[PDB]
Amino acid sequence: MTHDNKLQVEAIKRGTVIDHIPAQIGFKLLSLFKLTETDQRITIGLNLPSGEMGRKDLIKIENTFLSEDQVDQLALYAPQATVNRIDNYEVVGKSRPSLPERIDNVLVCPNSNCISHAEPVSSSFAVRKRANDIALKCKYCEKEFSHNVVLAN
Template sequence: MTKETQLQVEAIKNGSVIDHIPANVGIKVLKLFKMHKTNQRVTVGLNLPSSALGAKDLIKIENTFISEDQANQLALYAPKATVNQIENYEVVKKLTLSLPEQINAIFKCPNTNCITHGEPVDSSFSVLTKKDDVQLKCKYCEKVFSREIVTEHN
């Protein structure tokens, strides 16, 4: 680290750092994506000062590499997040997120009558984007929900 300022959360040797998560969304991301369900060390920083976001959350998972596809699943919650891959203390890859075409097995369908609630099937939404407006269409009940409705229910 050649930075003048000290890191707010200790550097890691190998693994993934999810940076620039909006403040208050870090815990949600951690739980929703089951990032805490690992034997690896996970460090979390909440409400860290950030010049770009004012305040941000940050998650570091050691010895675990998040693929591009997995990273993009985060885009609905944290579109400005960056996923850094760390090897031997160096940032070797920096992924910026883009919305995927499908989001599977993460969000519950907001429609309480949807078959996905009673059956052991994974949820599946196709992502529809019109300019900045993002909507999700459930594969099972075919209802369309705004991004806000889906994130509020999850």
């Protein structure tokens, strides 16, 4: 317990705080990475005031430590987030998402004739070339698309 407030709420004991999420990405991340199908208390703050981005989103999941590659799966959506790892009210760890070499399940192959659409396989894309803007290759049809195109539908 520590004097929370809501323009930046306070202390969970032990767990993950993903902070410095861009406005309107927080709910995407909740839905997309299924963060909510847990029994632990989650506290989420949306469109909050902060350290300059001005307005941000934040997610607090107690007792879950999602990491290393879970954190990396956050990089197309929230690349400038910080994933604080908390234990006994102390931020025993701060990391940021690095761009992963593979993004599974979350994307949709934009190629209409791809076979992934119809079937019990989940999507998978190979990622390449950091920040000057990313290309993703479908595992199955081997067609390479711009991340901004996969990320619309």
